[PDB]
Amino acid sequence: PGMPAPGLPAGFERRFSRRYAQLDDVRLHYVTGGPDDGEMVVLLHGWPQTWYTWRHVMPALAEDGYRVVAVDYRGAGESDKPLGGYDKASMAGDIRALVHQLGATRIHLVGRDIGVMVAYAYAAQWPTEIVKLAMLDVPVPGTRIWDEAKASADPQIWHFGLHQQRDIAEMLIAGKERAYILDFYKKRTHVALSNDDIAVYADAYAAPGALRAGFELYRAFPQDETRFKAFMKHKLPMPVLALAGDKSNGAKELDMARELALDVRGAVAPNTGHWLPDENPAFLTRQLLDFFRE
Amino acid sequence: PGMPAPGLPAGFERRFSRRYAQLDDVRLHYVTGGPDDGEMVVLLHGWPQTWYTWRHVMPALAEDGYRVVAVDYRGAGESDKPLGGYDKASMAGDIRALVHQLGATRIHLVGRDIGVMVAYAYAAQWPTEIVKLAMLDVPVPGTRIWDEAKASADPQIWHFGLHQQRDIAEMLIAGKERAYILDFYKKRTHVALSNDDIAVYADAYAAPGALRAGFELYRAFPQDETRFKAFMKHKLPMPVLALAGDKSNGAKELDMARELALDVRGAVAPNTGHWLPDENPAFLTRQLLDFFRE
Amino acid sequence: PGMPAPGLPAGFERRFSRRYAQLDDVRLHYVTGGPDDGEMVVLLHGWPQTWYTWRHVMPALAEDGYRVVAVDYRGAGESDKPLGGYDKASMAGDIRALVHQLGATRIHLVGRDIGVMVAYAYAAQWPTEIVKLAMLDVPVPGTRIWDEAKASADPQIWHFGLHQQRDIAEMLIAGKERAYILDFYKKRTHVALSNDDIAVYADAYAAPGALRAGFELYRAFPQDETRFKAFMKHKLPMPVLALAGDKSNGAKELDMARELALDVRGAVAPNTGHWLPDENPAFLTRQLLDFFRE
Amino acid sequence: PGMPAPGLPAGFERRFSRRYAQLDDVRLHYVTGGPDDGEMVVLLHGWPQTWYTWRHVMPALAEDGYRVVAVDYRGAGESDKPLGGYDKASMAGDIRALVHQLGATRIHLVGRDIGVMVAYAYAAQWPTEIVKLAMLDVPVPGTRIWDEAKASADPQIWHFGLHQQRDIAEMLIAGKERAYILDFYKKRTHVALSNDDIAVYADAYAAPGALRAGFELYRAFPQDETRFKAFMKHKLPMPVLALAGDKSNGAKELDMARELALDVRGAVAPNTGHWLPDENPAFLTRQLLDFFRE
Amino acid sequence: PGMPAPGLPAGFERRFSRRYAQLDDVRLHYVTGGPDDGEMVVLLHGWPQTWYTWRHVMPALAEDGYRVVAVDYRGAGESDKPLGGYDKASMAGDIRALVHQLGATRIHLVGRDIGVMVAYAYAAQWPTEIVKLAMLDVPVPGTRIWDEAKASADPQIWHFGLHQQRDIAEMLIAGKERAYILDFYKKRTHVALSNDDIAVYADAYAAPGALRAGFELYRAFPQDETRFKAFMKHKLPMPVLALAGDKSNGAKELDMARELALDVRGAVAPNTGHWLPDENPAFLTRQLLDFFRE
Amino acid sequence: PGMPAPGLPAGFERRFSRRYAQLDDVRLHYVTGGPDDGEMVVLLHGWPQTWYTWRHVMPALAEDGYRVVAVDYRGAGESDKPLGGYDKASMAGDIRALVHQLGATRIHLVGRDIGVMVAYAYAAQWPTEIVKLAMLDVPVPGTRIWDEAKASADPQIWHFGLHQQRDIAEMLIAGKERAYILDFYKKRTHVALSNDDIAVYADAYAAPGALRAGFELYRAFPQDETRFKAFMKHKLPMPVLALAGDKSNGAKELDMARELALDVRGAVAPNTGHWLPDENPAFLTRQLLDFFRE
């Protein structure tokens, strides 16, 4: 029993900090906590999200001694909104430059949606640098699960077309970010979420340039498909964990991951929709802690 | 003495949960609490309301051992907004499918306004399934009390015309839901309500499709009148309780119910307007608990 | 054959003029032409209209030697929008003050919709001053045709309720006058009209105070119903002509007038909707000229 | 020392209640507390205010055993917004009908701004019914202090012209109530107020009809001047207290009151602007308690 | 050589008329000309269009002795916007009811885009009533050309997804009809069109309910695909003409029609985009006249 | 007889030109025609106007051999909107700089409203440079007619207060220039004007800075009153003509001018309101030509 409880979990404000990393062109925002010497765990959100999606996962990771780094990737949240560089492979390079600036090289990596595309491109480009990789909720371009949704005209990716209309998508949705993003979020959730938590994301995407930069991730999709099919000719060597909720992609996340990697295990969260960190963080953290210590 | 106190009563968040039920086409949102094995009590709001109207009635019901289920019916609150199915008889079928999915068959049923129309159609269609039925605040289509308001051009149903103008009602009221619904609410209340509580409803009706779906309930009224007069040829067998406030429909709710059912008792809430759950929940819960245990 | 031709008929601008008349507490705008000494013919529009509705009738009246006076009544068009005086009997006093100010006493009088209510209250209050009375399109309060529409809850008067909600009607429709009024107009026409001509009306009602003043005509209906029923105990002595289109009120305009007057004749315009001067001015003009010279 | 503290004082919510009084046409909202048998004290706000302006005065009055009744007069706050009746003498009749419905006859009366006009008209019309009258902040129509501001074109009454423009004032200020009313308030205050408290008023005047009804008080001013000069031919018999802040009308409030009444005492609040209940409630309550018990 | 010439061709206004036809539950608007006894030719527009798209084709048809009937189908232009009936087969029933109401039985039938789907469902349901059928610009559901576009995720149907999001599409595009529709139109044209002519379409879709009604055409596509595949088991017996521009669907219009009909001929307009009646009416008119007299 | 004819008179476009003059800190826009060597006649508009108000007077002046110069003064029309210099005496310096820049020294000078204040300050500062002075419609600060209007609180200057509220006036009226200015204009006219002509003025004041610059004319009134009273100790020596309409200031324009000048003649236009050049240019033109050649 219990009504949705919005906001950061108790004690969060004391153990995490907001920080910036200046890369060559772009400044990235991220939130970090946990032991300065711990194994680094990087968490990458998707669309329409920010670092905030991980709020209920980050304390448990830090309390198990991980150095937690939750990044607003290029164009999202409080990060800069540059003109280009929104293909996932180049965005993986942004994350890597941030990791190196923090003194790390080998990391654990967790991604969902656009972030799982970024994460995969990070592992394909620098396989020796990713100790373990966890893949949540969405398939990556290049996979058959991806191609099947496209050829089916799957209802839950209806928005790819709209988002790929340069200037038209921005003109339609500017000023209506909250109504658009709340509707998007609730149609894919199964666990009841708080409007206040979803509004944290929506307000981020109403900031100047946030809509455009979010949509350019979609507009780079055909480039990602080409780049990713090339990546897929070399299966990933490191252990991979695939998770998704049963009301959304479910077992297809693990099907998808097996086309990508040699060493794969997976699970399906019960009574959970599209937003694993929002909807079922308890299941997510237990799976990650067992995976990372294994 | 006491100024209006907005929000959920103390302790509510701990004993109730928000949940979804997927029916064949439509997903319905509801809030539930109380013993899992208790006799189920279903509560149906009206226009412009959500489950939230019952917030002060639900804890007392659960504490007397009832399994409380307060539903956002088709098109309202956090439920889906489909193209059609807004005649009350079909909406009663939605509620019944939800009840069956929760493992129940025989229920106690409470409705107000549009919800009392839905509730009545539930009892007329499946009379053996409704153990007791409580009817609040508004008469149902087909009754003489209903027809008399229409032929009188009663001032408090001036909005039937406007709401029945497809697209015109939405175009006029979109963007002004809060000013429109607050004015609507306060003109029919007698006990002073908090603007914050009324704004919970208004914000629900500003969500995409909520205005249209709310208005299609009105646009189905001529169909309901025909269906309901057919229902009324067989009087209801189960005990029925009729309640309304003295500043609004008052004793006419009990007059109305006697055309519908054989076994009827009623009361009039003192110094109470149109919104019995908002205005006088203490009177309402005492009447319901005496009725349900009798 | 022929597409709708917007604007004033050829040669109108040269033969008619716009003028203002300052009365005690209202300035009225009116348009006039024809011989300065001719028998005066006064034409009264309704809602949502101005004098401009008579554009196709006025030249023929003037060319037959009548002094044509087309009035924007209190609150409409370019007339003033005072605080009160929107009961039809008091508005008929405005028209009389204007007629007297122009040097005339006996008039021929033509009204439609709200203007036919004003016209009737003019004839009832000063019967010796009305030579002949023509009644178009809409029944007047107090008649059985009026009372039946309300008790039937006739769909074509759905807007009475909305218009009687003070401040609520203005707030909903302000800024949407064109969309509101063009939809209202086209739903009641049968002859295709030009959007440019309907936009002349719509733009008049967007001017400061024009919505309020128009709606106050509706808000005075219960006062009008009481007053007119008293007028109706004395049937009018002067000749009366009743006209309406077959796609709208048709023969009921003549039924209604026979309750008001002793000397009544009528006709029904074929393939004509609610707006006789806009839709079929040729039929109207022939009827008015035959009646006036008879 | 101390930053402005917004909101109701501690303990207010427990000892006061919001209630309605239905008069013949109009429903008035008021807030009341204190002993049911105590001498009644009625408090009348001005423009742009509601009962809320008295929040810091009402507890001290109740704790000295007064039955406190703070009214939203006709058109303001949560009261109805009728078509007319905004001349102060008729508004005094509304307050008297409310007082009688509460079982009282003899009262103490406090008014400021428009409310002090209402209060004075109450005392002039029913002098035996007003035990003591306190007059704050603004002079009443008919006085020389009033006429001198008008002939001077005093800057702080620049808005009389604008407010007296029917429909133009509403069209300019609708949607900008908060910016307009905050600017109005701060330009006349001397003690720093909280924006949150001023926003309580501004939001009240953005409700449907609140702007129009507020402005009709100004539009009745020429009628009030005539009525009030007639009232002034009979000086008031009961004791009168005149108060104002030194940064605003100051000693002119007592000058003004001496043209109205025979038995007059006054004081000037130090370092206090136009809004005595908002700015210096401590000075105000001490003056009222000494006056009422004297 | 020549700049775009906006508006109706010279002499059109005199030879054609706008009319309404009241059917059971829909009033349809249409434009007609030519001899009252000529063989009837019905022209059906698509999205986002009205009858006005045929402006340059209708005079030549009438001058060759055809009775021209250009229909605004259910929900479009000046026609009514009912709640349902937007599956193409049911809309073909509207067109037939109109044809019969005009005294005709056998017709020549021309459609493009949504209108070519309606036209096909008309010929499939009542084949003996269609003398000849001309199919322009767009393939119909159920054909291989239609199925390939969806499985390819063809860029030029990106909007199907958005248009199928009920309430979301309306909320995003309301108030932006002109910018949305002019961009949509120009991206698919090859001949330069006048903004004034495209604005005729855009303004029609800004009218109350026009966005909803248009999008409901898209929302019925899965129902249409099922129905049309059943129609396609019986190839049409009457002669069929297929036309499309070379910069858009080109020869695929004839490929598609040979899957639907036994007797098919076609041509491809040179240097012509998606909008044959707007871009190259001279080519279209010659093709239609040669086909009709053959 | 005749309906309002909007626009420039026939043949105007060919005989007059728009030009700019760069002065030290302001660029002024003006319209000129007539013989390059003729005696110069300068025409100065008021609020809310531009040079366009003289459209019907300028051709007759030019055809009589005058060099016509109609100026948009500092801040108005197409002139610059600098930060200051809106006291009339300094603005008269702008006009003189322009006259000298055009090669002239002695001028005939015509002003109405704000332009008649500028014109008077021009004649008072450089009396030998003004051959004859014509004063229209409005009294100037410092005169008894001006002082009486303020002390009477004359209704027709209600807007002085609003216009003097810096930033508040701009915020309220921005975006509502057309509705604000058309209402202002029509309340002071007696001859019916075309909305299209008043909209020329209204659109000029919607341009960036035009509201501020116009209101700064009002905000300088107390500076103007002081300066003009000093000018008035020396009555003007050159011949003066005073004109105004009988429905507005009438004979008071001549009363006012006799306080300013020794050699004064005047006339009152019959059935003419506040806007002499718009309402009765024929009367104005005859008066100006007889005066100039006398």
Numbering used by the authors:
A (entry chain A), B (entry chain A), C (entry chain C), D (entry chain A), E (entry chain C), F (entry chain C): 11 to 304
Kindly provide excerpts from the paper associated with this entry.
Cfl1 is able to hydrolyze xenobiotic as well as biological epoxides that might be encountered in the environment or during infection. When we compared the Cfl1 and Cif active sites, we observed two unique features in Cfl1 (inset). First, Asp147, the Cfl1 residue presumed to be the charge-relay acid according to the pairwise sequence alignment with Cif, is not hydrogen bonded with His284, as is typical in acid-base-nucleophile catalytic triads. Instead, that hydrogen bond with His284 is satisfied by Ser258. The side chain of Asp147 is oriented in the opposite direction compared to Cif's Glu153 and forms a salt bridge with Arg122, which aligns to His128 in Cif. The second unique feature of the Cfl1 active site is that Arg122 forms a hydrogen bond with the catalytic water. The N-terminus of Cfl1 monomer 3 makes several electrostatic interactions with monomer 1, as well as a hydrophobic interaction mediated by the insertion of Met13 into a pocket comprised of Phe22, Phe26, Val41, Trp61, and the hydrocarbon portions of Glu23 and Arg28 side chains (cluster 1). The absence of this region in Cfl1 is a major reason that its dimer interface surface area is smaller compared to those of Cfl2, Cif, and aCif. Comparative NMA between the dimers of Cfl1, Cfl2, Cif, aCif showed that the ex circulum (i.e., out of the ring) dimer of Cfl1 with its smallest dimer interface is the most flexible. We hypothesize that Cfl1, but not Cfl2, retains sufficient intra-monomer flexibility in circulum to achieve substantial catalytic activity.
